[PDB]
Amino acid sequence: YQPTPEDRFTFGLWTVGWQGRDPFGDATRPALDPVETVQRLAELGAHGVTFHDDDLIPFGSSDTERESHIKRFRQALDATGMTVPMATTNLFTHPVFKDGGFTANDRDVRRYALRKTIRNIDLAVELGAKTYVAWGGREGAESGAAKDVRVALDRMKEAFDLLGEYVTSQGYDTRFAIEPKPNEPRGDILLPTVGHALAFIERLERPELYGVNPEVGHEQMAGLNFPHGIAQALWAGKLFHIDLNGQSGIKYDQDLRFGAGDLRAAFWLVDLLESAGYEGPRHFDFKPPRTEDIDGVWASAAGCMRNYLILKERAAAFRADPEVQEALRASRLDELAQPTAADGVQELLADRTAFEDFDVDAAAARGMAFERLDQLAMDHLLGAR
Amino acid sequence: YQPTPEDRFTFGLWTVGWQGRDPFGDATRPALDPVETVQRLAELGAHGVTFHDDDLIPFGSSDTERESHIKRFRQALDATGMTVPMATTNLFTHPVFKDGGFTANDRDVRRYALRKTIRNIDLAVELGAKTYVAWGGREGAESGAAKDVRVALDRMKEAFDLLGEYVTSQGYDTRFAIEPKPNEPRGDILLPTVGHALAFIERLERPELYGVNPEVGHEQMAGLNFPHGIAQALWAGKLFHIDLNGQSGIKYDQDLRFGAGDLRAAFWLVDLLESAGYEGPRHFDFKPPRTEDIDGVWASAAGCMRNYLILKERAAAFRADPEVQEALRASRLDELAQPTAADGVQELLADRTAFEDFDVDAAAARGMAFERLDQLAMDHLLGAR
Amino acid sequence: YQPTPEDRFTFGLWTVGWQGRDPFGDATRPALDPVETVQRLAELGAHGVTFHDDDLIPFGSSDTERESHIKRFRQALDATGMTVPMATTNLFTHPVFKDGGFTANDRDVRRYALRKTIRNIDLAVELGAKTYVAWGGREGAESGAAKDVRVALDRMKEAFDLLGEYVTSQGYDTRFAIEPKPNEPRGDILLPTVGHALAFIERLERPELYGVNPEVGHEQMAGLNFPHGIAQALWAGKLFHIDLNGQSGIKYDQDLRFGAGDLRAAFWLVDLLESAGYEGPRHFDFKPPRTEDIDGVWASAAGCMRNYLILKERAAAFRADPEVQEALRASRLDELAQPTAADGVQELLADRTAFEDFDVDAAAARGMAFERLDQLAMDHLLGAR
Amino acid sequence: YQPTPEDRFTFGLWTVGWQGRDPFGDATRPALDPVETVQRLAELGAHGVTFHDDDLIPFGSSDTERESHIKRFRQALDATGMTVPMATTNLFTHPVFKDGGFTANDRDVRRYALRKTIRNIDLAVELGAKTYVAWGGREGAESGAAKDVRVALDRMKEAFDLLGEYVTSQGYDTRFAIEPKPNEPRGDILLPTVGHALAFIERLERPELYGVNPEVGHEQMAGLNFPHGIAQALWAGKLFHIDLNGQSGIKYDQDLRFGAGDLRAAFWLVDLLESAGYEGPRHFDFKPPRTEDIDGVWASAAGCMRNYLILKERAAAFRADPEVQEALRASRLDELAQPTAADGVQELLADRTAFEDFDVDAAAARGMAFERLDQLAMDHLLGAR
Numbered sequence A, B, C, D: 001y002q003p004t005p006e007d008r009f010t011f012g013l014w015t016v017g018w019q020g021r022d023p024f025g026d027a028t029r030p031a032l033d034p035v036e037t038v039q040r041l042a043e044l045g046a047h048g049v050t051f052h053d054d055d056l057i058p059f060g061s062s063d064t065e066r067e068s069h070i071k072r073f074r075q076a077l078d079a080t081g082m083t084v085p086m087a088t089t090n091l092f093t094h095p096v097f098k099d100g101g102f103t104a105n106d107r108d109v110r111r112y113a114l115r116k117t118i119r120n121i122d123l124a125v126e127l128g129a130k131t132y133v134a135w136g137g138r139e140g141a142e143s144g145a146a147k148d149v150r151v152a153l154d155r156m157k158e159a160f161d162l163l164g165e166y167v168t169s170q171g172y173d174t175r176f177a178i179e180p181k182p183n184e185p186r187g188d189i190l191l192p193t194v195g196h197a198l199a200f201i202e203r204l205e206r207p208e209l210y211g212v213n214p215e216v217g218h219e220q221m222a223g224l225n226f227p228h229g230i231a232q233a234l235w236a237g238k239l240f241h242i243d244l245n246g247q248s249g250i251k252y253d254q255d256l257r258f259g260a261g262d263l264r265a266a267f268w269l270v271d272l273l274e275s276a277g278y279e280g281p282r283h284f285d286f287k288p289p290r291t292e293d294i295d296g297v298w299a300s301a302a303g304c305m306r307n308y309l310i311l312k313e314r315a316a317a318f319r320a321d322p323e324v325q326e327a328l329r330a331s332r333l334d335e336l337a338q339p340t341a342a343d344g345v346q347e348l349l350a351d352r353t354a355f356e357d358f359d360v361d362a363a364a365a366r367g368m369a370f371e372r373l374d375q376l377a378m379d380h381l382l383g384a385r
């Protein structure tokens, strides 16, 4: 279960780099230099790194000091072979984005938001990123009249159509992935789930430029089944990126290392990613618990990739097992793939077997055998098979 | 706060008609005849009624006894002036729909599902319904391998495209509203929120025939802000119907009378429905708590409409108040309506005031005054103003 | 991983005998004869069965029909060597209970409830039950003024006090175990968590005759840590019995088979009970899904036992592992067991190294080494180690 | 609805003094001088302020700087007639606490925590505090093996026992009030609910020196009924103090102003405390949103007091209403107060009307009349009545 760069595992600079501050405490670890992070990650067997502009270049740096940062970073990438698949904007930390970035009530703060973003898009594309994520963590409200949602969305649609026009005019090959989240730090964040984000993308001027970047713990802060949501992102053809971590319940977002939190949901997400051939980076946006020192950080981080590869093995052994292939026919998972009525309406209506002569009760009593199948999955996760 | 038929309040036959059975208990009230329900509701001041085929016509009734039911019902409507704005199918109760209706693994049960639905669509349109709701309460799973979600959705899309073709061929003016729900009775239901349902409708053959039918308690079983979701259904132009009730938390769906459960969320939903000019029925899909006898039922039911009209008054007094109109300018809710960059990209990029010369910190310190505004809403809800 | 009576695995008649009617669903299974259930669970390796009074004797039986159901049950237990370690009363199915048993507002319903419980305490004793469970499913409320809850804690205590007087006047060697649950079938239930039941006991006249019977799913309904809840109850000496099952987070109570739901909490639970030296029943309170026929009912009751036995084996190996031992030392679980200040408050107060010359910066710099310890735990659970 | 000291409304220095840094956000406000806060809260009508040791005296101060901060604070309290009813210790901000204070695995951190608490018990006593709050925010865990929780309940009890010995050896007229919280800043926190804190107290050497300090938001984090939780604590005689605020369901702790969040639970809370005759502080533990400047900080601290006073007035009128009295009788809240069986177990057992000749069908047919009683309650709250 040794990670190699062929596995496409990537991490955020801010993940291993998180210093330990939370609503009730101060930093527990030092600030990590992005060069030591690149180097360490490459020795852990990771494939790449990602970044918010303010992880790389500390807010309000001039162009000198901006260059000095990018250059020492670009040397650490060249030397390691590490790649930067995705980058993003910090439109949440500075006191100025307290009521948002793209949907801030103040018109000045909103146009700025966008200048800060376009500036970083040019660094991302230079460094090789093919996805540009946008997590609108400040777009929402703690009270009902503070934000009119129909207009704030007109604004959000305008801010994305503005970005879609600029990439189109510059000829970049970059695509945007919108990252939904139900709450935290705002009381309610706009586009709270993968569903909302999928529907919102269909109202942007050029929908094809836009997908989602789901995050495990996010959808589970809404008590939702993450593999189910990802299957709908896949069905739409909109899983551009995926953020992986752990969450132990409906509570504040924990950002545990992946495989921690809900373990059976972690197994079905690996199973689905792998059975549907997801190509993108397996990115860990997670937070080494502030109880740890730096050794615990790279450890927590190695554990993210270990559990991915272990669950990957158990999901392939499950799908491969003849007895489970048989168990799927027993539960009629082959009949689900069958068209309900390729032939059509006229045919269905006419069919007496489908209503008039249909023995409902015989059919009611055909057991689904779902439990035999789920214990086979349980033994395969546990390696009792 | 006297309900009149001009207020468009409507109820389900199964709401006041619910006998009191739950996962741990038996019926506490008798079965209510749909004629006594029509009559009683009209005397309460309601505008109309709705129905699942099996509320009206008891499952497997022949055509004689089917006619006998519809006719005595149609006489109670004629005599009262009561209207039937919406109807639907019970694709959840009978033991045969234990693994779904439209996405049942068994192909036979699926085509049947549809015959049962098309049959009822013809009764609905005859009776004057303009919306046909579909609540797929059995479409989901309690375990990961029991349902492949990408295929079950291909099936769900096919089942809806099949219905969209039949209305198109018969020339009916009926539209479909899809009702999302996170869970219960299935462990995870497909299309768990308004967001998911909006995005799914964009992949049906004729999207224009389809909207949502949100339900208050549903989105709050996902810990989500219901007014926020409804604003996105409105923005899309997809709020075809709305189901109103109460929910006191993330737990089993309670179906409390409306205004019960989350009261501040009830005030912002009325405020939004009214400020955006929703035309549809104000439908109460709720359940008189089984502690009640029949007097408690019509009482609980009258309380649904009372709280709608009381909250309606407080929302109009809030929007009307000069001091609150002033409070909205103070929080810059007028600037949210303003285009971010009608002029465009070139202009924004060039603008030094929007990035290069922008004083972030002055702007950071412009307080939002959100709290003064939310206490003004609080005094208006409470009638301290 | 095949069970035998040595494992003390038990199952209520109500669990495999669930007919599958839920809020929106008719029963999908035929009732099971009790005598068939003790046979089939004996053949799968069970220790014995438990029951509610109205599980074994139909409500209303008459008092020769009762005689008969008891003789048949007795003979089947004697035939298989199946025990009856626990029994309980049903104070939630019949409508006389719609407002509660011990705390209904109607006095005469609290008298019919108290007398009904004493009838089954006598029978339970004759059959060999040494624990009597009390789950007040209907005690609680939907609205605020409906229940004065300080006077309801008065009526709860009165009942449990008279029940204690009753069994001590009889010389009955039996103890009570109160089962908490936060909600369902009531909006909120009285004594909603483990901590709430434990606190109530201390105010009873004979605190020693009472303990707690916690369920996995009930504490998970409130997002609590079920292993921690079990540890506080063993710390208090009050874990008299337990109900094992699974639950996928905060929603309706599903009662999935033990092992399903939060699989790592089931790992951590079995590590606790086996380490604890808990020697009461491993009782399963689960429902086979209504998707399942009677074969699938037996694949799910066997799944319960199998999951617990894999889990015991994985937890046993985790704790025996040299690696894990060194990591526990590294995370100072041994320092946690040394007293903070056995040297009294006076030498603590004069210990200048406890404050004045405590170095908080060398103490704050130390990593806890919990991510590495938890990854060794994940490795054992997945059979990677 | 203007407050005055007669209303005993208090506020920690940490509440209006929150600078607004959250998980993803830098502080949006300047720190407040303590002396400015007692002045501004005195001018709004407060009773007094509370503090954590490191709120009044900066961590690391030196032991003349400490002298000075105490003298300045004293003089400002004496200037305004502001009291200091409660004080607490900060065992959660500094990294030495990252694994806990009283239950860190490191022994020497449990010694620095115990000594730090005793330093502030002395100071609190001199200033007039008759309640000492203990919120173990960092006591608990993120992973299972990290904390043996039965040995952590040993270390918790040891600390609270030595603290009891300390204050009785001193003759200090002060009592402790343990504050539960389910999670944040730890994945799960020890003593997570009211019931869990109440149960722990009974095992201490001097149960009488300890009570509970529950917060609205903390019980709501677990979806519990906060009015019911407060009623069990007054039933046990243990409500020593309270923290009032608001929370919109299950998610991170927001600490909204009292009145916001679950407005009807705030109604039902104030009905309980005013009916209860609770005469301790009405303490607000809230955060003005980080959206707000310092004027908006004061519009939110004034909102707290105003909401409680409207609510007291609406609840007072609900209970005084003839209509409500008759409805309470109709829902037999008076029968709930008559003993079930004051006539002992023996005449209960021979009362043939308690069982043999109890008619369960005429008892089951009776409505509880709770929807009508709850709608009269909704009418009072909205000022419709």
Ligand SMILES: OC[C@@H](O)[C@@H](O)/C(O)=N/O
Pocket (backbone or CB within 6 Å): C052, C088, C089, C133, C135, C137, C179, C181, C215, C243, C253, C285
């Ligand atoms: O009545 C016994 C109780 O254990 C059980 O059936 C349950 O857990 N209800 O939720």
Ligand SMILES: OC[C@@H](O)[C@@H](O)/C(O)=N/O
Pocket (backbone or CB within 6 Å): D052, D088, D089, D133, D135, D137, D179, D181, D215, D243, D253, D285
């Ligand atoms: O430490 C005192 C405690 O009351 C407070 O600040 C809190 O409620 N934390 O959640």
Ligand SMILES: OC[C@@H](O)[C@H](O)/C(O)=N/O
Pocket (backbone or CB within 6 Å): A052, A088, A089, A090, A133, A135, A137, A179, A181, A215, A243, A253, A285
């Ligand atoms: O700002 C980038 C974003 O992905 C971030 O890591 C997040 O989702 N925190 O909740």
Ligand SMILES: OC[C@@H](O)[C@H](O)/C(O)=N/O
Pocket (backbone or CB within 6 Å): B052, B088, B089, B090, B133, B135, B137, B179, B181, B215, B243, B253, B285
């Ligand atoms: O089947 C119609 C549907 O609207 C139903 O009332 C529901 O949503 N129960 O959860």
Ligand SMILES: [Mg+2]
Pocket (backbone or CB within 6 Å): A215, A218, A253, A285
């Ligand atoms: Mg995140």
Ligand SMILES: [Mg+2]
Pocket (backbone or CB within 6 Å): A135, A179, A215, A243, A285
């Ligand atoms: Mg993310």
Ligand SMILES: [Mg+2]
Pocket (backbone or CB within 6 Å): B215, B218, B253, B285
């Ligand atoms: Mg519903």
Ligand SMILES: [Mg+2]
Pocket (backbone or CB within 6 Å): B135, B179, B215, B243, B285
């Ligand atoms: Mg509905």
Ligand SMILES: [Mg+2]
Pocket (backbone or CB within 6 Å): C179, C215, C243, C285
């Ligand atoms: Mg149970």
Ligand SMILES: [Mg+2]
Pocket (backbone or CB within 6 Å): C215, C217, C253, C255, C285
């Ligand atoms: Mg249960």
Ligand SMILES: [Mg+2]
Pocket (backbone or CB within 6 Å): D179, D215, D243, D285
């Ligand atoms: Mg507090």
Ligand SMILES: [Mg+2]
Pocket (backbone or CB within 6 Å): D215, D217, D253, D255, D285
């Ligand atoms: Mg708090």
